[PDB]
Amino acid sequence: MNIFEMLRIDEGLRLKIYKDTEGYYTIGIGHLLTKSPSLNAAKSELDKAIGRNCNGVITKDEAEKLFNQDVDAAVRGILRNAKLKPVYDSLDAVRRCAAINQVFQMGETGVAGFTNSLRMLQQKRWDEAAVNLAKSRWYNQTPNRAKRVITTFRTGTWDAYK
Numbered sequence: 001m002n003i004f005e006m007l008r009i010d011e012g013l014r015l016k017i018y019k020d021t022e023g024y025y026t027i028g029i030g031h032l033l034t035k036s037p038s039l040n041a042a043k044s045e046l047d048k049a050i051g052r053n054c055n056g057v058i059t060k061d062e063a064e065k066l067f068n069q070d071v072d073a074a075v076r077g078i079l080r081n082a083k084l085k086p087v088y089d090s091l092d093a094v095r096r097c098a099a100i101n102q103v104f105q106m107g108e109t110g111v112a113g114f115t116n117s118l119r120m121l122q123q124k125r126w127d128e129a130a131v132n133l134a135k136s137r138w139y140n141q142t143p144n145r146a147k148r149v150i151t152t153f154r155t156g157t158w159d160a161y162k
């Protein structure tokens, strides 16, 4: 198991524009196109990202290309973040995957506000952090996924991903 596989599991793969769990235009492997509700604003964004006139549709390869850049951007986001960086480097390799998963899903910003959990994770207080993490909108809106990540942080293994 690795980050790619992990996230491929959590976000799935769609070749046509779609609406995410929050109602936003997205494509491929969880790639967010726009928060706006204009489908057209969405296609424009898609074309810009792909570099061609997609008409709302993409190829596998293309999706995967966006995914790569996307994984990449997130780690790099983590790395640059002062609040995040130090936590991330104090983790082992599996738990780091769990951090990238959340940042992918919610942005560096959202994660940056999980102050208390951040701290708990830093101190290696697994069970404590897991309970903390659950006390969030994130858990409440996307419980199944959230549970997976949390068990990830919690145990340090891929059990949740079986």
Ligand SMILES: C=CCNc1ccccc1
Pocket (backbone or CB within 6 Å): 078, 084, 085, 087, 088, 098, 099, 100, 102, 103, 111, 114, 117, 118, 121
């Ligand atoms: C507490 C939330 C975990 N998320 C997170 C993200 C990046 C680095 C370290 C931790």
Ligand SMILES: [Cl-]
Pocket (backbone or CB within 6 Å): 048, 049, 050
């Ligand atoms: Cl792009």
Ligand SMILES: [Cl-]
Pocket (backbone or CB within 6 Å): 141, 142, 143, 144, 145, 146
């Ligand atoms: Cl879910």
